[PDB]
Amino acid sequence: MGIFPTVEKLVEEMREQLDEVDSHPRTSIFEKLPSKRDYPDYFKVIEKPMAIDIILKNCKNGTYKTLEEVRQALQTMFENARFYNEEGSWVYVDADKLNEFTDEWFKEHS
């Protein structure tokens, strides 16, 4: 297929993972990074920001070529969320539940 269509299909599945309480997509807060001017503290805390739109873009420009680099990118993304957001908050919960889905997705992909 190619790295981009493969990851493009992974994102579509991620976006279909819904929260059990209000059905909001678990990818809601991971779609894009905050605007730095409005959220300067975030970029002082998180040394390596990452978001879904950057992952897709990097699979389209040659930056990411394998699924291992994409899994490492997603892991950094989930690590940043768990680090910045309080444990138990809905962002923290979305990160864990979505990280469990991507872990399973990389195992089933063979």
- Classify the C-alpha dihedral 16-17-19-20 as positive or negative: positive
What's the CATH number of domain 2-110, 3.30.9.10, 1.10.10.10, 3.30.457.10, 1.20.920.10? 1.20.920.10
Listed resolution, Å: 2.2
Q: Where are the domains of the chain?
A: 2-110
Residue type, 43: F
| Strand extents, DSSP E, the chain | none
Residue corresponding to tokens 């279909």:
16
Percentages (nearest 5) of helix, strand, coil residues in the chain: 60, 0, 35
Q: Which experimental technique did the depositors report for determining this structure?
A: X-ray
CA dist., res. 72 & res. 77, Å (int): 9
The CA distance from 25 to 97, in Å, is 11
